[PDB]
């Protein structure tokens, strides 16, 4: 249920970083579990692309969210395979 998590992230903004970033990323990912949102996967890829533990926890949850949102459809999973390989070798 990704239509009722914006307030959740707003509330989570209170907690201090870097755990705040990890919590926000994980909550956002679990909000759109299987929804196949291209924009949210794009934000997750942005998060993964930036290199800073907990900061690495952000990227780990971002990759897990990429998989979660991509699992909805066959095309999404097949393309996420290539994206995951690319980000593994890079």
């Amino acid at each position: 249920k990704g239509e009722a998590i914006e307030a959740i992230l707003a509330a989570l903004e209170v907690v201090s970083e870097p755990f705040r970033s990890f919590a926000n990323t994980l909550v956002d990912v679990c909000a759109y579990a299987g929804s196949g949102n291209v924009l949210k996967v794009q934000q997750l890829l942005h998060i993964c692309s930036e290199h800073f533990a907990d900061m690495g926890a952000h990227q780990g949850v971002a990759v897990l969210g990429i998989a979660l949102i991509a699992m909805g459809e066959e095309i999404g999973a097949e393309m996420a395979l290539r994206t995951f390989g690319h980000l593994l070798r890079y």
Partner: protein, 178 residues
């Protein structure tokens, strides 16, 4: 090991007919493609040790580096390498070369001036052979064959099923038709 270098292929679009569902599928594939492009374009740009070792190795190696054939291994730091023109040279094996791969008949990489062995060429595959490898898989799938069912079943049991479900053959005790 050098596992399979399977040909790359994009997923298949089912609608075929120019309906908006096909447009959505192609748009999703393009979105993931742009996704990968942006990610890998930011990686190097967004990117800001081993550099010292790499520089030392490359400065010792020098360029250009000749590719020759290793004829024999005399000592742990000496070998006889025959240059491409057929002339044999008693060159010195440098430290930064895994002695395990150094076997007679391998294509060794040599310094241009002193001819000292600096690396072993792994692939060195004949260019007339590397062309044969199928990189872009053809778009014609099984649904693109009318009938030829028995034939499809036989070919699958010979070349396709053994990889996917080798359990059946292993339990039955019969090596799949190769």
């Amino acid at each position: 090991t050098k596992g399979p270098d399977a040909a790359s292929k994009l997923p298949l679009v089912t609608p075929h007919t120019q309906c908006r569902l096909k447009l959505l599928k192609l748009e999703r594939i393009k979105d993931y493609l742009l996704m990968e492009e942006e990610f890998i374009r930011n990686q190097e740009q967004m990117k800001p040790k081993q550099e010292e070792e790499r520089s030392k190795v490359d400065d010792l190696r020098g360029t250009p580096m000749s590719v020759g054939t290793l004829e024999e291994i005399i000592d742990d730091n000496h070998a006889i390498v025959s240059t491409s023109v057929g002339s044999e040279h008693y060159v010195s094996i440098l430290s930064f070369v895994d002695k395990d791969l150094l076997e007679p008949g391998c294509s060794v990489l040599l310094n241009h001036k002193v001819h000292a062995v600096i690396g072993v060429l792994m692939d060195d595959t004949d260019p007339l052979v590397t062309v044969m490898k199928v990189e872009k898989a053809p778009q014609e799938t099984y649904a693109d064959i009318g009938g030829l069912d028995n034939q499809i079943q036989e070919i699958k049991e010979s070349v396709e099923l053994p990889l996917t479900h080798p359990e059946y053959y292993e339990e039955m005790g019969i090596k799949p038709p190769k």
